[PDB]
Each structure stands twice: as C-alpha cells, then as structure tokens.
Symmetry: C2
Subunit: 201 residues, 2 copies
C-alpha cells in the first residue's frame, strides 16, 4: 500500500491555483520511483563487492563503515520519509478536522482557511526545511558531491594506509545526481509555494 | 675439502713469534664454523616465511629485495671469502716461490724474508682492508646494527605503505652480533700484526 494511499489524502480536493501543486507531487512520485529502482539494485553491492587490498582482518568492515556511515540509499530513503511527513501530517490534519467539525455541527469556513490553510503554510516551510536539511548532509557528509572509484582508508585495524574499492561508483553517482537534482527542483517548487503565501500574506 | 686444506698451506711451518699467529687462524676456523651453522639453518626462512600483509601481487618479492639486497649469510660468506684470499694467496706465493728457487739452484734467504715477508706484510694490510671493508657495509648497508621484527616496506607495487615481517629476526641478529664481534676481534689481531711490522720496520 505504498504510494497509492498517500495520494488519497495527499492529492486533496481543491486547495490552491499555482500549477506547482501537482507538479511537486508528480515529482514526489517520480522521486520515489527512481529510488525504488536504485536501492534494491545498485546498493546490494555496496558492502559485498567493496574490496580492501589488505589481509588484515578488522580492516574491510571498518573501511566501509568509516566511509559509508549512513549509506546513500538509506539517506535518500530518510529524505523521502521526512519530506513525506509534512505532506501526510497536513492531509491527516484535514481529513480529521474537516470530518470532525462537519458531523458535529450538522446535528448539534473561516477556520477551514484559518486552521488548515495555516498549518499547510508551516508544512510547506517544513517540507523545504527537510528537503534542505538532507540536501545539506548529502553534500557535507559525503566527501564532495560524488564517490571515487577507490578510497584510501585509514580505518583503525588496517596496516597503515590501505586501498579499498567501491562498486559501480559511477552508477552510484549518476543516481546521486538525479536524486540530488530532483532534490533541488523539489526545493524550489516548495519555496515558490512558501513564496506565494508570502506575497498575498 | 673446505677448511682442512686451507691450513695445510695456511698453517705455515715457521713465520713469526707473537701468539696472535694461530689465535687469528683459530678464529678464522671458529668464524667459518659459526657461519656454516647460521647459513643452512636460519636463513632458509628469510624469503619463505617473510610475510607482507597485502594481497597485492608484486609486493612481497619487492619488499624482500628492496630490504634484503645481499642477505646477511651471503655477506658473511663473501667476508670469509675475501679475508680468506690474502691468507691463501700468500701461502700460495710461498709454496710456489720457495719450491721454485730451491729446486732450481740446487742442481743449476735474503729474498725469502725479502719477497715473502714483504707480501705477507701487505697481505696483513689486505686482510684488515677487507675485514673492515665489509664490517663497514654490514653496518652501513643494513639499517642500524640489527633487524626489526617487522618492516614497513614501500616497495613499488604495494598499495601505499604495507607491513611485512621477518623470520626469527632475533636469532638472525644474535648471529649478526657474534659474526660482527668476531669480525672486530679478527680486525685487531690483523692490525696488531700490521702494528708489529710497523714497530721493527
């Protein structure tokens, strides 16, 4: 039930008129599509085929870890999770508060645009706070903007400075580009919607 | 026929009165005894059990070589060969020239002490030139006065700086002591005989 249901409350009935309402969510899907291709496919090798040229027991495990602390596809994953949260917390705040107020004063819209159009504005703030909180780590945490073919790893139990080699570090980067590019694009659409709610107040 | 025959001409009939005439040759034997124990025994392992912690093909061979250019027991060997040469060149110069002059003027001793007691003086000079030519290398060539348990070897085809380990580097040193000690002792006896031929001219 991953994807189809997030839209049942996420693709809301009638919120705003900016052409960036759907665009942002079409990417949100696209972006979980690209990642549900990367993960199971290109990262299985991450640890397996990660070769350190040393016989020194400790080394290889330590050389992956010291070098791949939260692997990319679990970062990418966390991103899509956190940036998924505001989207579904709001949609949850709506289908609850709207269903509540309605069926309670029917037997016995200034607060529909008040309460909900307001938390939605802070959501859009949250979206770009996350989309950019990770976009940050993904760029600061991981030794530049991509990964090299080999790394020179000083992990503790290696003898001095050893070599190690990653698996498909280009295919791995390729997918770090797209997912980082779409991570920027999905930042602007988010900030354009935070801009449109700063224009008319 | 190694050792017994070198004395048949080396342990000459009646040359000088210093108590260092035999002493020096008793060591010469002792010193080939200690080496004919070391060699076949402690150095076989030199290359075999020389372990470099790397998977990198070229490395181990290059790490022995860059580190053991002329192995100790072949140096020790060369020593005993070169410092053996003056001893047997003189003894050869005698048993020839003495047999010659004798059987030629019998049918038809100022030159026995002239020619031979003179080349023997330059021999003693040669002995200590060699005994000290190697004693020099053996101390300058080989990274201090002994060998460590492990070496950090930068041999070309190793990845960066790798470890390697020697075999019995103490037993190996132990025998480098004795053979270097006796290499010094056998220097002094040689220089005392060059001294006694500098005292009375």
């Amino acid at each position: 039930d991953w994807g189809t249901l997030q839209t049942i409350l996420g693709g809301v009935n009638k919120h705003s008129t900016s052409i960036g309402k759907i665009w942002l969510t079409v990417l949100f899907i696209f972006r979980i599509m690209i990642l549900v291709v990367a993960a199971k496919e290109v990262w299985g090798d991450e640890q397996a085929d990660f070769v350190c040229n040393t016989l020194q027991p400790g080394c290889k495990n330590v050389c992956y870890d010291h070098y791949f602390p939260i692997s990319h596809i679990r970062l990418w994953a966390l991103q899509l999770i956190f940036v998924s949260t505001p989207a579904l917390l709001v949609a949850m705040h709506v289908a609850y508060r709207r269903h509540e107020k309605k069926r309670k004063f029917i037997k016995g819209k200034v607060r529909i645009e008040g309460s909900l159009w307001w938390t939605y504005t802070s959501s859009i703030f949250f979206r770009v706070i996350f989309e950019a909180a990770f976009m940050y780590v993904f760029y600061v945490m991981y030794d530049g903007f991509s990964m090299q073919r080999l790394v020179k790893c000083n992990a503790w139990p290696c003898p001095n400075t050893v070599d190690c080699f990653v698996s498909r570090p280009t295919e791995k980067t390729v997918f770090t580009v797209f997912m980082i590019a779409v991570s920027g694009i999905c930042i602007l659409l988010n900030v354009t919607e935070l801009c449109y709610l700063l224009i008319r107040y």
